[PDB]
Amino acid sequence: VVIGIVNNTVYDPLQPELDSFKE
Amino acid sequence: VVIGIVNNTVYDPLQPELDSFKE
Ligand SMILES: *[C@@H]1O[C@H](CO)[C@@H](O[C@@H]2O[C@H](CO)[C@@H](O)[C@H](O)[C@H]2NC(C)=O)[C@H](O)[C@H]1NC(C)=O
Ligand SMILES: *[C@@H]1O[C@H](CO)[C@@H](O[C@@H]2O[C@H](CO)[C@@H](O)[C@H](O)[C@H]2NC(C)=O)[C@H](O)[C@H]1NC(C)=O
């Protein structure tokens, strides 16, 4: 519904931090 | 690069909570 949106990736500070530790 | 800064420790609400549970 928006005009002019572009693709990208938004970095999530929690995901790698809590995936490296939990393993 | 700052004048007047002082030492201290900033408490992180996530670290102890996710370290006690994950163990
Ligand atoms: C990146 O942006 C493009 C267009 O801005 C998207 O391309 C279309 O996306 C829809 C929905 O996913 C598809 O139905 C179309 O077939 C796509 N067209 C083309 C030419 O690719 C695209 O989805 C966006 N994301 C990625 C990962 O490419
Ligand atoms: C606490 O603050 C003091 C000064 O405000 C810091 O002391 C200097 O720190 C630098 C970099 O760590 C060192 O190269 C100097 O040798 C230190 N000087 C002295 C007299 O200690 C100190 O680093 C800060 N942090 C701690 C944990 O003390």
From Swiss-Prot, chains A, B:
Q: Which residues are glycosylated?
A: N7
The organism's superkingdom is given as Viruses
Briefly, what is this protein's role?
A: Subunit of the fusion protein that is processed upon entry into the host cell. Mediates fusion of the virion and cellular membranes by functioning as a class I viral fusion protein. Contains a viral fusion peptide that is unmasked after S2 cleavage. This cleavage can occur at the cell membrane by host TMPRSS2 or during endocytosis by host CSTL. In either case, this triggers an extensive and irreversible conformational change that leads to fusion of the viral envelope with the cellular cytoplasmic membrane, releasing viral genomic RNA into the host cell cytoplasm.
The name of this protein is Spike protein S2'
Name the species this protein comes from: Severe acute respiratory syndrome coronavirus 2 (2019-nCoV)
- What gene name does this entry carry? S
Q: Which residues of the full protein are shown?
A: 1128 to 1150 of 1273
